[PDB]
Amino acid sequence: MLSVASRSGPFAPVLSATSRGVAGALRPLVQATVPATPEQPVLDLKRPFLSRESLSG
């Protein structure tokens, strides 16, 4: 129960040879997008978002 993954809180980075390490908890997002204009920083040698977790033919 004591793992932070079950709780809202700090991210635990998941560096890997292939897969991107999306994880963690709020730290609000998506809910921030519902109000108008959260423009967010772009292209600081930025990695692509979402990641291809939904692979299909």
């Binding site: 004591l2 560096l15 390490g21 730290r27 040698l45």
Partner: protein, 419 residues
Amino acid sequence: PQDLEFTKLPNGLVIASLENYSPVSRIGLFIKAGSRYEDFSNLGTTHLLRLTSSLTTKGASSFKITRGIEAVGGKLSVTATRENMAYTVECLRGDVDILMEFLLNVTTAPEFRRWEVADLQPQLKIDKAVAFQNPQTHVIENLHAAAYRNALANPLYCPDYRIGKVTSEELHYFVQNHFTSARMALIGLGVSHPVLKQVAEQFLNMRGGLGLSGAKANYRGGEIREQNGDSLVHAAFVAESAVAGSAEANAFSVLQHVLGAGPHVKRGSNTTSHLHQAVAKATQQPFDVSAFNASYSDSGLFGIYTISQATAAGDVIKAAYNQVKTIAQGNLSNTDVQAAKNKLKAGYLMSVESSECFLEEVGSQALVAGSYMPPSTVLQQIDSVANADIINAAKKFVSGQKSMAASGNLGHTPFVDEL
């Protein structure tokens, strides 16, 4: 048709396995070593240490590890956090004995080639930069620095001045001082327990028990204002909270979930949340407020986190704090508590549900406890909580001194103790 078989060793290394029937076997090896274990003499060491996993060791070339794991089609990942450093690897079921042979190797006798490490130092800027692509990380891995005198104050990411000067010798020192067998624990999924009894036998020769285990992480009330050109100021009131495994921690959990800490319906205002509604009539829509709770074995943290327009922030964070104060008055409805406890049940079940987060769960729990606790047993404790413990929790959050962090324009945000 199977439940996990917890087990220890004469060596003291915890081991466990939960047989499944999914084709991808998935084993993980967790260590108690983390970012809180640095002192001032070495810092950002772990941030490199997790990057160094792909490097050549005494038992294998880096080309062999990379091309080998990729040829298998499996993959390795190094999860990391302030309390724990969690190695993990996934593969097809027939491939296990191969990839694990890399796994333990990477953590048993790494050879930190100094030139390779110097080659990986520039990478630290890239990883640290993409990690801060989200401002909230910049806020919290800064807020901890604002809350703690000592151990937990240390950033997960390497400080900019250390990016070019981390040395392999520090890596070795941290490795024999913190990859102790007593600190380690091993978890499997597709792999059966009895074969883990022998494949994990390899590590018994490696590394004796007991590590270093310094520090205590004392609290501090200081602020860290930053002042940037960003319009959407972030903010985070924080007060110390008891954790972990205490019922009081359960009280703070139910406390955050009363306050709408958890996301639910898309494209809709969180009407049941006290904070979103307290702010929605306080200021115009562009905002996002939510409760924040962090669990660490020495001590934990609790407090609101807010995103808001720079002009509106002073109204927003104060409204959100007053919303906590009303609960601190003992004015709390019976129903929202039930809804919150339900949000915790569904939430914890959602966290446990995915196999990878389940592995993080069983392992992170295996380190701190040495006794696996099935989720229903969690449900009796989480149902056990009384309203009075919650009221006392809010009273504790209000009575305590406030740490705070706040990136943004800061043109209107009140200083801690001024709001």
